[PDB]
């Protein structure tokens, strides 16, 4: 229980050290793409719900 945990911690630290962290430019690109996708999906859903609330109230 102790030795497997120590080995896992050492391996995780080594992997994090050898990973390729996102640079500013890469992080900016990923954040911009994620923000654009979230805006698209969430705002399309929000507008659909906002239109359908009066329509739902009218019909029912």
């Amino acid at each position: 229980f102790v030795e497997p945990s120590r080995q896992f911690v050492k391996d995780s630290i080594r992997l994090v050290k050898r990973c390729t962290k996102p640079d500013r430019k890469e992080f900016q690109k990923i954040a911009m793409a994620t923000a654009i996708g979230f805006a698209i999906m969430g705002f399309i859903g929000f507008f659909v719900k906002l239109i359908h609330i009066p329509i739902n109230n009218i019909i029912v």
Partner: protein, 443 residues
Amino acid sequence: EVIKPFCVILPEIQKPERKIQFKEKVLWTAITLFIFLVCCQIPLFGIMSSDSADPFYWMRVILASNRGTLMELGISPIVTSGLIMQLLAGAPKDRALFNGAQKLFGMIITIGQSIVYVMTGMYGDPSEMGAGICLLITIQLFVAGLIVLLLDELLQKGYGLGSGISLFIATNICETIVWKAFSPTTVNTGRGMEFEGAIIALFHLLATRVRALREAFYRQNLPNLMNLIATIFVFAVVIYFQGFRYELPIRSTKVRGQIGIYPIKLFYTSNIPIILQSALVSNLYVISQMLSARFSGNLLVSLLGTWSRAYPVGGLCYYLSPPESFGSVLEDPVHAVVYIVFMLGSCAFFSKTWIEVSGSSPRDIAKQFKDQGMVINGKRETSIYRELKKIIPTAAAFGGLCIGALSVLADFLGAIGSGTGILLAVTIIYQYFEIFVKEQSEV
């Protein structure tokens, strides 16, 4: 073979021989998600009442469902049919037959779930409804499930970037976040007319009335600006950790001269640990709630969870539940510790099990390298599996641990959308972004 006669009686999306460029794929994905969003806001006909408790409130996030509307089964038929057929397989024309069986089992699951939903007590009393109303609800849900399968097959056959499941889950989560941030819905209690939307409340409170900032930020009955700040912070952190990758320099030995980088992401399994853990926890919630509703008093049901929106107070479902607020953490630190340990351990275990099952294991990646002649740049062909055995298992386990930690952090900070929701949304959007960059690099 008897499935094949019934496999042909269902429509299939026309497979485009010419590949579609990214712009039209994005436009058609937007059209598909718009259709799904419109469908999930249209209530069913014949619903007598929706004042009863909601039996499956824990599935509405992972299954992209919405109670009382056309999209009430959500994506559950697709996931159920896919899992069933994958288990059957584990136990050209072949793929056409496979897709036909997919559709047939999806329709069967849709009918079964519609019957269960009708008879479980919601929409009103099924006996008082009559045959006509319940039947009409059944056809409405059947056609809704058929449309969901058609949209998913469209996305998979190529008019869309990814799959229907991920698109619908991410779309529902993003819509929920944006609604909690910008809802014009107003609720009154006596202090005044207050907007539910967090940002809308800030504009309203300042215009109507320093305290206003405290009311908009530290509010405890409607979405807050601090909750939105936590959501943005978790978005940023999950994006940063998703960008992590291990870059193996690989060469080619068959075609002498071809150089590339094989990336082993930190989130090796993507959102699979979150999907598996959240599905398990939600199914446990549903089972415990239904058992406690009927067989209340049994010791086993009490251990499975005692409920009080009904939230657990004791039992396995309670210890699997995030703390309600900070005060919940202070009052029961033991529950917080047990939940954190469960989240991290379950996510790591699910990640390693998934790399063992799906086919991304170090042995499978080494076999793939041998099939393609790819060798690591400095490591000898002999040390191709070992250099993968030193990375892929650790990467998978640590990615599961990190994604579970991010979910715990999002839940503790009070993020709109919740840990699961936010993590699923970010992972799916990053999948779309990586598809985009792959298409751009190919060009």
